């Protein structure tokens, strides 16, 4: 009964995902100083911090989920936008990593703009404002759930996993990450990863056509809305590679 029992788990993953969701229109309504350009700037910095510290692949997108949700409830100053991003990484690393990021090392990554007494005092303010709803559903959760249903070899599962995890990181820097739920971001990353990087001819045990129809059936978005999410991703990959 793996067919129903896996939808039993997936139904619960989609229902809990609908709670830890930000509003896409907080730039116009909530924030005054913060602009959509300034979010990509602080998100790129948070990504590099997790790159250098060899963080768990889940830490950076989880920290951005905290950032979008806090910006959906409270206005933050332009100067304090970086302080907010450091606090989000401080909590996300606690949730996923064995040994989290030290608050001192996070302040060093801010070029010592903030102090550890300011990060800890922001930790209480951030967690209280998020109603302690920190166990948010992540794109990595759905990715690992989708792979368990794909009958690909483990060597190909791990290369699909790496490319999909990479596509999720590029999404977190774009404003598409705000409106799209983690189910879409995860599925769009997988279908963009199973096409490879146009490096070789795609040879896979489960057909790409069957995989798109399967993912678009369970996460509930028609193939026209799934390929649109994939084309945005490959556009983010194009924009990422161009800025180099």
């Amino acid at each position: 009964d793996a067919n129903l029992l896996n939808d039993r788990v997936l139904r619960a993953m989609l229902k809990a995902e609908e709670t830890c969701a930000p509003s896409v229109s907080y730039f116009k309504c909530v924030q005054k100083e913060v602009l959509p350009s300034m979010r990509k700037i602080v998100a790129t910095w948070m990504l590099e911090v997790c790159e250098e510290q060899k963080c768990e692949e889940e830490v950076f997108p989880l920290a951005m989920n905290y950032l979008d949700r806090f910006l959906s409830l409270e206005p933050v100053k332009k100067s304090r936008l970086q302080l907010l991003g450091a606090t989000c990484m401080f909590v996300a690393s606690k949730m996923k990593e064995t040994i989290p990021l030290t608050a001192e090392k996070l302040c060093i990554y801010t070029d010592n703009s903030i102090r550890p007494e300011e990060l800890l005092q922001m930790e209480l303010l951030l967690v209280n404002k998020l109603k302690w709803n920190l166990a948010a559903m992540t794109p990595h959760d759905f990715i690992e759930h989708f792979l368990s249903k794909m009958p690909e070899a483990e060597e190909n599962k791990q290369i699909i996993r790496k490319h999909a995890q990479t596509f999720v990181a590029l999404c977190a820097t774009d404003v598409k990450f705000i409106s799209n739920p983690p189910s879409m971001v995860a599925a769009g990353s997988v279908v963009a990863a199973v096409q490879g990087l146009n490096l070789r001819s795609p040879n896979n045990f489960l057909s790409y056509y069957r995989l798109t129809r399967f993912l678009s059936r369970v996460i509930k978005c028609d193939p026209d809305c799934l390929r649109a999410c994939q084309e945005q991703i490959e556009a983010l990959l194009e924009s990422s590679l161009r800025q180099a």
Partner: protein
Amino acid sequence: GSKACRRLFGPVDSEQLSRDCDALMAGCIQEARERWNFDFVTETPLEGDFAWER
């Protein structure tokens, strides 16, 4: 060394951060005790809808 260490938007008025971080912390306390009539920081009062008995 590390190209990721940098300030993103210039300086920070330090005290005003400690001034604000307490301004909104007490706002969370007010939202807390206005939901359940019970001052969280002093864990004592009534007057509202609560019953409260040790």
